[PDB]
Amino acid sequence: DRELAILATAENLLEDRPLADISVDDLAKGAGISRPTFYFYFPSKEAVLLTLLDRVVNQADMALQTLAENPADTDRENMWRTGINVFFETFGSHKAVTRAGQAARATSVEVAELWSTFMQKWIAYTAAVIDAERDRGAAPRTLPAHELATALNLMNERTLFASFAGEQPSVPEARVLDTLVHIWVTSIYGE
Amino acid sequence: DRELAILATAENLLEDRPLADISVDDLAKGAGISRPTFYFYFPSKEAVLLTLLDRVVNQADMALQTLAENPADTDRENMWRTGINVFFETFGSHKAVTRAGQAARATSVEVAELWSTFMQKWIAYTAAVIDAERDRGAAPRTLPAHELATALNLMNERTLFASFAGEQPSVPEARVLDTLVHIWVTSIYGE
Ligand SMILES: CCCc1cc(-c2nc(-c3ccc(C(=O)NCCC(F)(F)F)cc3)cs2)ccn1
């Protein structure tokens, strides 16, 4: 409530400047509370970013779980596109949290562990689907599925986030989903 | 000379701890010089890391130029393996400089611009070879070559460096070259 106001203030300010340049007083002020009232809800501004990242990561995770439970009736290319799109739309809808959360992996063990935990879960699910595709005779047994999954997930992390940040170099945001789908489909189904 | 001693000291200390935990006095002490003598050679410890990274990046760049000028007599898979191997061996021989240099992209515009400049050069060369392969009828015209090149180069940056750092998740270092070659060959030659 005042908690949701603090989180919304932080996400808004992170569009303008880095967490380094945002004070607890900036977050309190934005949320219409005092500094000590802020400390009732969060121990630090770093905790606010951790909560924002945790919400975005869990949103992507629950969207991927929804696909898993409600698979689309489409070809393998459109299937992998639907999965990559969960990450494109979820993180691409929260670019300031994505940028700040990735930067915080350097300084926060809690942010690093959160990111690590979910990447392990997403890679494990990727590998499980590749193994299912191999089991049904649709994909060839080339690389170990978990190693292939790891590299494809790490490609998407770096490529999606470079695109969102407009880094030089980056794939244009309007081309990045097609670019990643090509590489996933050719590497998963290619001999 | 005393310059090479400062650089060798810094590369040695970076194996033990982050640049944050290395003082100018630590570098002077290691190089057998005083603090003011250090400032005769480098303006800051940040400049020392920039020079170390610049040397490693130029080593990889000159190795790739050597391949370009002395192409191996081998199949397309072993050809791309030779190119990725330049980065695997060069950066993998300097893991502390690689780790510290990547971390410094966050805080140093000079490190960020150096990294950006060379990634643009490597992606441009990748695209040029893919276009040559398309021109000779060996590769199909699928994605725009520069967009495919960008994503493959960014995959290698994230995947090689996660492997060297032993991040969770990462591909084991002994498996990462085969993993990347698979994805490059299938995505460049795959319909
Ligand atoms: C089988 C029927 C249900 C189903 C499953 C999928 C799957 N997609 C993925 C996946 C995982 C991670 C990514 C991914 O982008 N990681 C990187 C995450 C980031 F945060 F770093 F970007 C993409 C797809 C894994 S299974 C797609 C469609 N339908």
Ligand SMILES: CCCc1cc(-c2nc(-c3ccc(C(=O)NCCC(F)(F)F)cc3)cs2)ccn1
């Ligand atoms: C045509 C005959 C000469 C030739 C050329 C190649 C080429 N290889 C690459 C390349 C570029 C970047 C990478 C790469 O790993 N980037 C990422 C760099 C990093 F620093 F981030 F890791 C790999 C291969 C580009 S052309 C290979 C063999 N023989």
